[PDB]
Design a protein around this nucleic acid. Structure first.
Ligand SMILES: [K+]
Ligand SMILES: [K+]
Ligand SMILES: [K+]
Ligand SMILES: [K+]
Ligand SMILES: [K+]
Ligand SMILES: [K+]
Ligand SMILES: [K+]
Ligand SMILES: [K+]
Ligand SMILES: [K+]
Ligand SMILES: [K+]
Ligand SMILES: [K+]
Ligand SMILES: [K+]
Ligand SMILES: [K+]
Ligand SMILES: [K+]
Ligand SMILES: [K+]
Ligand SMILES: [K+]
Ligand SMILES: [K+]
Ligand SMILES: [K+]
Ligand SMILES: [K+]
Ligand SMILES: [K+]
Ligand SMILES: [K+]
Ligand SMILES: [K+]
Ligand SMILES: [K+]
Ligand SMILES: [K+]
Ligand SMILES: [K+]
Ligand SMILES: [K+]
Ligand SMILES: [K+]
Ligand SMILES: [K+]
Ligand SMILES: [K+]
Ligand SMILES: [K+]
Ligand SMILES: [K+]
Ligand SMILES: [K+]
Ligand SMILES: [K+]
Ligand SMILES: [K+]
Ligand SMILES: [K+]
Ligand SMILES: [K+]
Ligand SMILES: [K+]
Ligand SMILES: [K+]
Ligand SMILES: [K+]
Ligand SMILES: [K+]
Ligand SMILES: [K+]
Ligand SMILES: [K+]
Ligand SMILES: [K+]
Ligand SMILES: [Mg+2]
Ligand SMILES: [Mg+2]
Ligand SMILES: [Mg+2]
Ligand SMILES: [Mg+2]
Ligand SMILES: [Mg+2]
Ligand SMILES: [Mg+2]
Ligand SMILES: [Mg+2]
Ligand SMILES: [Mg+2]
Ligand SMILES: [Mg+2]
Ligand SMILES: [Mg+2]
Ligand SMILES: [Mg+2]
Ligand SMILES: [Mg+2]
Ligand SMILES: [Mg+2]
Ligand SMILES: [Mg+2]
Ligand SMILES: [Mg+2]
Ligand SMILES: [Mg+2]
Ligand SMILES: [Mg+2]
Ligand SMILES: [Mg+2]
Ligand SMILES: [Mg+2]
Ligand SMILES: [Mg+2]
Ligand SMILES: [Mg+2]
Ligand SMILES: [Mg+2]
Ligand SMILES: [Mg+2]
Ligand SMILES: [Mg+2]
Ligand SMILES: [Mg+2]
Ligand SMILES: [Mg+2]
Ligand SMILES: [Mg+2]
Ligand SMILES: [Mg+2]
Ligand SMILES: [Mg+2]
Ligand SMILES: [Mg+2]
Ligand SMILES: [Mg+2]
Ligand SMILES: [Mg+2]
Ligand SMILES: [Mg+2]
Ligand SMILES: [Mg+2]
Ligand SMILES: [Mg+2]
Ligand SMILES: [Mg+2]
Ligand SMILES: [Mg+2]
Ligand SMILES: [Mg+2]
Ligand SMILES: [Mg+2]
Ligand SMILES: [Mg+2]
Ligand SMILES: [Mg+2]
Ligand SMILES: [Mg+2]
Ligand SMILES: [Mg+2]
Ligand SMILES: [Mg+2]
Ligand SMILES: [Mg+2]
Ligand SMILES: [Mg+2]
Ligand SMILES: [Mg+2]
Ligand SMILES: [Mg+2]
Ligand SMILES: [Mg+2]
Ligand SMILES: [Mg+2]
Ligand SMILES: [Mg+2]
Ligand SMILES: [Mg+2]
Ligand SMILES: [Mg+2]
Ligand SMILES: [Mg+2]
Ligand SMILES: [Mg+2]
Ligand SMILES: [Mg+2]
Ligand SMILES: [Mg+2]
Ligand SMILES: [Mg+2]
Ligand SMILES: [Mg+2]
Ligand SMILES: [Mg+2]
Ligand SMILES: [Mg+2]
Ligand SMILES: [Mg+2]
Ligand SMILES: [Mg+2]
Ligand SMILES: [Mg+2]
Ligand SMILES: [Mg+2]
Ligand SMILES: [Mg+2]
Ligand SMILES: [Mg+2]
Ligand SMILES: [Mg+2]
Ligand SMILES: [Mg+2]
Ligand SMILES: [Mg+2]
Ligand SMILES: [Mg+2]
Ligand SMILES: [Mg+2]
Ligand SMILES: [Mg+2]
Ligand SMILES: [Mg+2]
Ligand SMILES: [Mg+2]
Ligand SMILES: [Mg+2]
Ligand SMILES: [Mg+2]
Ligand SMILES: [Mg+2]
Ligand SMILES: [Mg+2]
Ligand SMILES: [Mg+2]
Lengths: 260, 134
RNA sequence: GUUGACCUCGGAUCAGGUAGGAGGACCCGCUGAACUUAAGCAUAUCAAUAAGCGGAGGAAAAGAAACCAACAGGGAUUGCCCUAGUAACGGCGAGUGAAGCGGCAACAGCUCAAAUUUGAAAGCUGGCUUCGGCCCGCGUUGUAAUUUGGAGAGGAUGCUUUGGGCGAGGCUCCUUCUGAGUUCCCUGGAACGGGACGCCACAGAGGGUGAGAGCCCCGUAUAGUUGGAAGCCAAGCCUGUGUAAAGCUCCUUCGACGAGUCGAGUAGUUUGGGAAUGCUGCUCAAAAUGGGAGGUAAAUUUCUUCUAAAGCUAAAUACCGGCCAGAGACCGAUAGCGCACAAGUAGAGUGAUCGAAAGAUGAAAAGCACUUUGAAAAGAGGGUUAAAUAGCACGUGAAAUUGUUGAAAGGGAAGCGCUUGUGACCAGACUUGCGCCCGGCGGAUCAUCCGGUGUUCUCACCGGUGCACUCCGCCGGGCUCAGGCCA
RNA sequence: CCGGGACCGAGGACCGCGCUCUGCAAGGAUGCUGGCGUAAUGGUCACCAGCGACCCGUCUUGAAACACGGACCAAGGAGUCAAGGUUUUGCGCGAGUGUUUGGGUGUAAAACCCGCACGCGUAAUGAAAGUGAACGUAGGUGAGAGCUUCGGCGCAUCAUCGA
RNA sequence: AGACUAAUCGAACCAUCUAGUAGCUGGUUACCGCCGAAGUUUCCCUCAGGAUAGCAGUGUCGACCUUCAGUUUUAUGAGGU
RNA sequence: GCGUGAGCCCGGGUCGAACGGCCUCUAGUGCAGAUCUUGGUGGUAGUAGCAAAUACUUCAAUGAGAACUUGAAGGACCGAAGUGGGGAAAGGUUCCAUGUGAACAGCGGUUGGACAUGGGUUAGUCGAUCCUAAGCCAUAGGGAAGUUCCGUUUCAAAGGGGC
RNA sequence: AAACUUUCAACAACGGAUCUCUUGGUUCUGGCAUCGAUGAAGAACGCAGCGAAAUGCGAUAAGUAAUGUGAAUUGCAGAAUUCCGUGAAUCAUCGAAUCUUUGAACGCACAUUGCGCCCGCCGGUAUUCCGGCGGGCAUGCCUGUUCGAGCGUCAU
């Protein structure tokens, strides 16, 4: 509050009274009379540099750098070693990227939670769903008082085409803990790299995979970036004939023997 | 998850409303389940508890005991059932308070208004299922 | 002379009405500082701000050009972005500082004075009233219709326009109803904990219940469903009719337009406004193609653009003061409002005013019956409880400071660094391991080959064969090697 | 050329320089033997003994100061936030760059999408009216990393004469 | 009498402007590693204060540029202690 | 037990409902000092002191307990400008009776202006009420942007008596 | 050798730090527009079966009527309804009422529970006096009504 600590009429007593110079309350008949005020070191005073509401809470990001980062996250979602290093259980999924036929499209195809839960098990996503259910704890601080009581893990993300699939599948997957949905044309970096860590586990639909290239074509002012290298495999380059045939003979070994 | 904007999910507001509720609201908060026989007979699952009906205890230290409801102490959120008591130092007998959510009603006090309650809830409870069946 | 008017000014506890005070976060005006900065200080700045005074509403205010411009022209008011820290002001120091154009949010236009109804004051307050009007009064020193500059009045000309009543159907508000385990075992005073087996989910938000509960209870999701009231919009139907009133196309001629106001001089204040941007006091004081403006004072000649001195009007904008509601990378009882509590309270001051401290027994009071000592307060037994190492001086219970018990030192401070000694107390390490030979015991099936299946395509696994000088395990005896501390 | 003592043993297959050359004292310690296997070695604390040792913080040329503050303990207690500049580090695009004043949309203060104006940059110089960047393979000379057909070509940058 | 005006008078008491300004006194909170000063020049109503140059740290870039030096030697100038 | 160090880890006791490691993000983030703020506690220390107003003694009763409670008997002081008998201002139940653990009466206390429970203030003649004084404020009027300032008989058409 | 002073541990004291908790603050966002002469905001005094405060109410006083719900309130006690119909409750809702003395505050005053005037009814022999009860009497201004003033001024 703007007036906290400044609702008194204290004044300094000045030197000569054998007390420290600091404003003191005036009057008599209470404990409060004669006590210090207005200081950051005083009980019931004002704090040092009170906080204001015109600090910067939001941040501006170039739209080109936003689009770069979301594309980089989609590419990392098709690398199975990265999925395991982010904590996902994918030992029984047949292929990555995982694509399911449009059997989730019709009216009430998976509009029931029982049907949607059954489909995830057959596809091979069951163990990752059970991982979330078994992880649930009480938060470890004062966040419990402020509306944030529990913590849990993250599960698969489901990407669909609202024009062809029909948007009725959002109801079916909503109540299962850990499962999120997102349309193919509104992808979110907060969901694709939760916590700043890459490799989210994603389940696509056939209609959505067909639309993905058209989505990136219609982005004015953006084209998919070019890389700074061309061959990412470093061992093939160093151990090729083009390079190994012009080198100088080795000058030593990995361990040098001690002389003198 | 809640959707409507008039619903609040706040720990502070929810405890305040519970512990300062008036008397006509405390009646609904103190409900109990019916037994399987009555549940089948009436097609009703729960009802607010009333003085003058039988009860069996299914939780706590006084399990498997039965009796009639002698008082509904809404100011304390407890009920008293006959013959479940305790002795003070002097030897005087004093009843023990049981929360109504860990008893089951095995026989309910009946009158004209009680029958209206049971008929009203049953009719709606089956109309929902009939419309849901389509 | 009498009597009857008119004008102005009064009385009445005459009939009927209306204002004051509170609130003032935001709104419309008046009045008005100094601290401070200029490294001193007077013009300047702080500031056209704080304090003081008057007047309104859910918004107020502003508003349909006496505007901007200088273009190929825009077109009432308000607010955001940009113009722009720019033109300009300033002991030209410190410092200060707008507007037109451009994009958007929101869009909406109007009524008086100045004319003769003059073949008919055609207008209005009040009283009484079968309800249809009647009666006095106001008013010709002007109440209705007609006209407002975009025009209009007055003439031609021949087409077009309008009044009532029903009304399906929909929207808003209140109210009744809504899925699934108290299944079995262990710990525990008490499952809401661990294990096993199930179910619901457009509902796994939140809270309670003897400890972390989707299925014990309230609620949470979804469109529906029982009943009730008042408004708003609206598809489409049924009916009169030109007495009257209204729009359009052309034209010789007409065409009223706000005065101690504009403007000028001078004084003060104010603005970015500079031979003077606005406001107010005093003196002078207009005009009919006249008048204002056109950011450098003046005379002469042109040009452009509007039309002052009378008035009304929704939206986009401000505000958490009032009544409600939803939230947070906020605080967690010396923090957060002065106040989580019988807090603007107790208390102080003649008064204006000043103004605290203070949350937590236990799931449940089950808040200690009885005996005994004591004048009593209380003590000792004995009880309740999972616990009294929870007894209302009540969760946990740190330090300063103090009591008892135990160990030790002390010839005018004590405490501390390096290094031995004595006494007390104590962590590690070690207890065997691999191999070879001899004997006993038990079990297989060791090498090879055939069939099948994988895979790194030559390497494996499974089935069959094997069947005692092979393979594996245990026990008993001997031998070599390696192993802890100090010399 | 022979004796006598003290302190130390880093390194961890071979490789080297060499010599008195079946081998060695030559690029860093091995061999043999005894006692004990636990409070014996070792560690912590208290106390006596030898030597050493002025009260901290602060201003100051100079503090143990007869210079100031400090009886003791617990909890609180001081370079922050906004706008505007500047240099340097990381990132995107690049003669361009910037979605978020606004509109569309949404699982609704998030995420996703759109483009008319506008800001900074692409041209300077004068008080102003105004005017406005190639003689040359975008010049000559001296250095210059790198490349090179070995004759030379010469980046960045510095000095110098010109357009 | 600069005396009295509620223990207050060479200008009372109360709330607000107000967290008034201070070239001046006091304080300013964990550890280890590497480098390491100045009290001097010029100007200021400047003398208990600032700006400016010097002294110091950090980041680099150009070549790893025959490159330099608080020094000696040889040849050759100036000086009035 | 580990670490040069700020620190980290384990054993024993008490206790009763939530908490940590790792990578990023964020800040009201680290105390011995400020005659620092709030609260609590020492030495001094059972220390300084509890000395104006002439003064007490015997027996009995009450009571757990008597110098400061009650009765009687002695000895004294105030000495009618009183330590007597009544009032005004001010206070507000302090008045009376019965009873009482703690706290208060700077020693004690069975006593109390303390603590608990009850009771108590009677007017045609005493006062207020009526009159005017110094003074204060309405009305007629005049100032002032205004909160309001002046004005009290005035430059006012200002009343009361009977049938 | 004790006592005394000093250091460490256990238990017991003094004091209220630490940990966990929260029907309270603080900040943001959204919706709405409603005080008063028909007596407001604020002040005083009273009201419960047993209450000092706090909360509520006004001599109809810890509340009355009306509508909904459907069996309580609770520290003690008593009593009522006990759902037939005639209905518990410091329940919810709220459209009909009551609402002391004041306050812009209004017959004149007020440091007083002070002093008047007008109309009506009821008692005391009463139009005039005394007592009880009911209704009234402020100021500024507007429209209208009625009674007036002035050689201001018209006609006869
Ligand atoms: K203040
Ligand atoms: K002192
Ligand atoms: K979900
Ligand atoms: K009149
Ligand atoms: K405010
Ligand atoms: K004011
Ligand atoms: K411009
Ligand atoms: K008429
Ligand atoms: K008219
Ligand atoms: K209808
Ligand atoms: K049990
Ligand atoms: K159990
Ligand atoms: K369980
Ligand atoms: K003028
Ligand atoms: K003109
Ligand atoms: K001009
Ligand atoms: K406080
Ligand atoms: K007082
Ligand atoms: K237990
Ligand atoms: K016990
Ligand atoms: K306890
Ligand atoms: K070495
Ligand atoms: K100092
Ligand atoms: K000192
Ligand atoms: K940068
Ligand atoms: K541009
Ligand atoms: K070169
Ligand atoms: K005073
Ligand atoms: K100075
Ligand atoms: K000389
Ligand atoms: K322990
Ligand atoms: K003593
Ligand atoms: K004496
Ligand atoms: K005496
Ligand atoms: K009297
Ligand atoms: K008498
Ligand atoms: K009196
Ligand atoms: K009287
Ligand atoms: K007088
Ligand atoms: K006046
Ligand atoms: K705490
Ligand atoms: K009250
Ligand atoms: K009087
Ligand atoms: Mg003051
Ligand atoms: Mg505070
Ligand atoms: Mg914590
Ligand atoms: Mg239960
Ligand atoms: Mg009247
Ligand atoms: Mg007013
Ligand atoms: Mg200031
Ligand atoms: Mg100055
Ligand atoms: Mg200064
Ligand atoms: Mg000065
Ligand atoms: Mg003001
Ligand atoms: Mg209003
Ligand atoms: Mg508005
Ligand atoms: Mg208006
Ligand atoms: Mg006009
Ligand atoms: Mg134009
Ligand atoms: Mg305009
Ligand atoms: Mg600019
Ligand atoms: Mg600017
Ligand atoms: Mg200004
Ligand atoms: Mg017309
Ligand atoms: Mg015409
Ligand atoms: Mg339910
Ligand atoms: Mg719980
Ligand atoms: Mg729950
Ligand atoms: Mg369970
Ligand atoms: Mg005009
Ligand atoms: Mg002025
Ligand atoms: Mg002027
Ligand atoms: Mg909140
Ligand atoms: Mg406290
Ligand atoms: Mg507080
Ligand atoms: Mg406590
Ligand atoms: Mg006892
Ligand atoms: Mg315990
Ligand atoms: Mg205590
Ligand atoms: Mg305790
Ligand atoms: Mg201690
Ligand atoms: Mg010693
Ligand atoms: Mg085999
Ligand atoms: Mg070695
Ligand atoms: Mg040995
Ligand atoms: Mg030893
Ligand atoms: Mg010494
Ligand atoms: Mg000295
Ligand atoms: Mg000093
Ligand atoms: Mg001192
Ligand atoms: Mg704290
Ligand atoms: Mg005095
Ligand atoms: Mg400050
Ligand atoms: Mg100050
Ligand atoms: Mg050095
Ligand atoms: Mg000078
Ligand atoms: Mg100094
Ligand atoms: Mg170079
Ligand atoms: Mg180099
Ligand atoms: Mg000389
Ligand atoms: Mg607990
Ligand atoms: Mg801080
Ligand atoms: Mg401290
Ligand atoms: Mg320090
Ligand atoms: Mg003494
Ligand atoms: Mg004395
Ligand atoms: Mg003395
Ligand atoms: Mg005596
Ligand atoms: Mg005498
Ligand atoms: Mg005498
Ligand atoms: Mg007495
Ligand atoms: Mg007595
Ligand atoms: Mg005493
Ligand atoms: Mg005593
Ligand atoms: Mg006593
Ligand atoms: Mg008393
Ligand atoms: Mg008398
Ligand atoms: Mg007056
Ligand atoms: Mg006047
Ligand atoms: Mg009233
Ligand atoms: Mg009364
Ligand atoms: Mg009366
Ligand atoms: Mg009136």
């Amino acid at each position: 509050s703007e007036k906290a600590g400044h609702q008194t009429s204290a004044e300094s007593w000045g030197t000569g009274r054998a007390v420290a110079r600091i404003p003191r309350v005036s009057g008599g008949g209470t404990h409060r009379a004669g006590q210090g005020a207005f200081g950051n070191m005083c009980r019931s005073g004002r704090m040092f540099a009170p906080t204001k509401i015109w600090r910067k809470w939001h941040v501006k990001i170039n739209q080109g750098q936003k689009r770069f980062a979301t594309a980089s996250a989609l590419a990392a979602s098709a690398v199975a070693p990265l999925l395991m290093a982010r904590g996902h259980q994918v030992s029984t999924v047949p292929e990555v990227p995982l694509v399911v036929d449009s059997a989730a499209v019709a009216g009430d195809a998976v509009a029931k939670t029982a049907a949607a839960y059954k489909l995830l098990k057959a596809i091979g996503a069951g163990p990752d769903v059970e991982k979330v259910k078994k992880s649930k704890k009480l938060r470890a601080g004062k966040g419990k008082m402020r509306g944030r009581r529990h913590r849990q893990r993250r599960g698969p993300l489901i990407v669909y085409s609202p024009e062809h699939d029909g948007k009725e599948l959002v109801k079916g997957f909503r109540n299962i803990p850990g499962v999120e949905t997102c349309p193919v044309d509104a992808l979110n970096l907060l969901q694709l790299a939760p916590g700043g860590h890459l490799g989210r586990f994603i389940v696509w639909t056939s209609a959505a995979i067909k639309q993905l290239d058209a989505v990136y074509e219609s982005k004015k002012g953006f084209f998919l970036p070019a890389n700074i290298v061309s061959q990412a495999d470093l061992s093939r380059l160093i151990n090729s004939t083009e390079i190994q045939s012009v080198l100088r003979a080795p000058k030593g070994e990995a361990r040098t023997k001690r002389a003198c | 998850m809640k959707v409507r904007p008039t619903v609040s999910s706040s720990r502070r507001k929810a405890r305040k409303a519970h512990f300062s509720a008036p008397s006509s609201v405390r009646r609904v908060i103190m409900s109990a389940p019916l037994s399987k026989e009555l549940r089948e007979k009436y097609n009703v699952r729960s009802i607010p508890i009333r003085k003058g009906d039988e009860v069996q205890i299914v939780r706590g230290a006084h399990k498997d005991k039965e009796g009639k409801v002698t008082s509904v102490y809404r100011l304390k959120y407890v009920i008293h059932v006959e013959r479940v008591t305790r002795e003070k130092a002097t030897g005087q007998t004093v009843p023990i308070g049981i929360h109504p959510s860990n008893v089951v009603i095995t026989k309910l006090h009946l009158d004209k208004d009680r029958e209206n309650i049971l008929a009203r809830i049953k009719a709606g409870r089956e109309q929902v299922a009939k419309a849901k069946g389509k």
